[PDB]
Design a protein around this nucleic acid. Structure first.
Lengths: 135, 138
DNA sequence: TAACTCAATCGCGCGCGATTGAGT
DNA sequence: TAACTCAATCGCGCGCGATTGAGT
C-alpha cells in the first residue's frame, strides 16, 4: 500500500512539473507565435539541421502522429521547409529557413531573461519508467 | 555564461516532459481494463480521499478548472464512477459524489497498479522544483 | 509478387487561454 | 441596475494507439 502512495505522489508531482514548465515556456514564446512542443522541435534543428522527421522523433520520443501536423504548422509559420528526399521518396526532410535559423538568439534571450543533482534524479526515473513499459 | 543556465533549463523542460509522458503511458496500460484514463484516475484519487466534493474543489487539488473537468466528469458519470448533481443551497455549484461502484472499485484498481511496480528522496526533489516553478509563474 | 518501412491519417481525451451566461 | 462567482462552452494543439497508403 505505501509503495502505491509513493508511486501516486510521483505521477502527480511529475504531472504538475511538466505542466508548469509548459506554462512558463508558452508565456515567453507567445510573442514568436510558437508552442513549447514546436520549440522542442526547433531545439533539435538548431543543434542538427537538416533532419528527417523520423530523426527528430527519435530525439524527442515522438512519431509522425504528432510530428506530421506539427511540422506543417511550423512550415506555414515560416520556420522550416518540408521536402521529399529524391534518394528515398518515403522520407521527409526538415530544413530550417533563414528566418528560423536567425531567430534562435532572439528566442533564447526572451526565455533566459526570466539544481546540479536534480537532473540526475529525473534522468534515472526516466530510465526506470522506460524498462517498466517495454517488455 | 547565461547560455549555460539556458541549456540546464532546456534539459529540465525536456526531462520532466519525458517523465510525465512515461507515467501516463504506464498508468493507462494498467487502467485500460477499468475503462478510465489517467486524468480520471487523478480525479478519482481526490474523491477517494474526500467525498463528496465540488468541481471547484477537485480543481483546486489538481490545479485544473472546469475547462478540463466539466467534460471529464461527464465521462466518469457516463461510465458509472460518479454522480454529478446541482447544490440546492447554491445552484451555480456542482457536487461530485462517488457511486457505490466508484467507491468499491478502489481496491481493485490499486491492486492492478501495485502489482506491476530509496525513491523517497526523489519525491522531495520534485516537490521542491514544483514549488520553485509555481513562484516563477506568479 | 511480397515483405518492409516510411509519413500521413483517424479518433479521442485532455490542458488551457479565453469567453459566455446562468445564478447569487 | 451592478458586482461577483460559478460551470459550461469554444478553439486549438498536442500525445498516442491504431490504421492507411505510397514507395522501395
Amino acid at each position: 500500500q505505501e509503495q502505491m502512495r509513493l508511486a501516486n505522489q510521483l505521477c502527480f508531482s511529475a504531472y504538475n512539473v511538466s505542466r508548469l514548465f509548459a506554462q512558463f515556456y508558452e508565456k515567453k514564446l507567445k510573442q514568436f507565435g510558437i508552442t513549447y512542443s514546436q520549440y522542442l522541435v526547433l531545439l533539435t534543428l538548431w543543434e542538427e539541421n537538416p533532419q528527417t522527421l523520423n530523426s527528430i522523433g527519435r530525439h524527442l520520443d515522438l512519431s509522425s502522429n504528432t510530428l506530421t501536423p506539427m511540422l506543417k504548422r511550423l512550415e506555414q509559420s515560416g520556420w522550416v521547409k518540408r521536402e521529399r528526399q529524391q534518394s528515398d521518396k518515403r522520407q521527409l526532410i526538415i530544413t530550417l529557413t533563414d528566418n528560423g535559423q536567425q531567430q534562435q538568439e532572439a528566442v533564447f534571450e526572451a526565455i533566459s531573461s526570466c539544481y546540479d543533482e536534480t537532473k540526475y534524479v529525473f534522468e534515472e526515473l526516466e530510465q526506470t519508467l522506460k524498462h517498466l513499459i517495454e517488455k
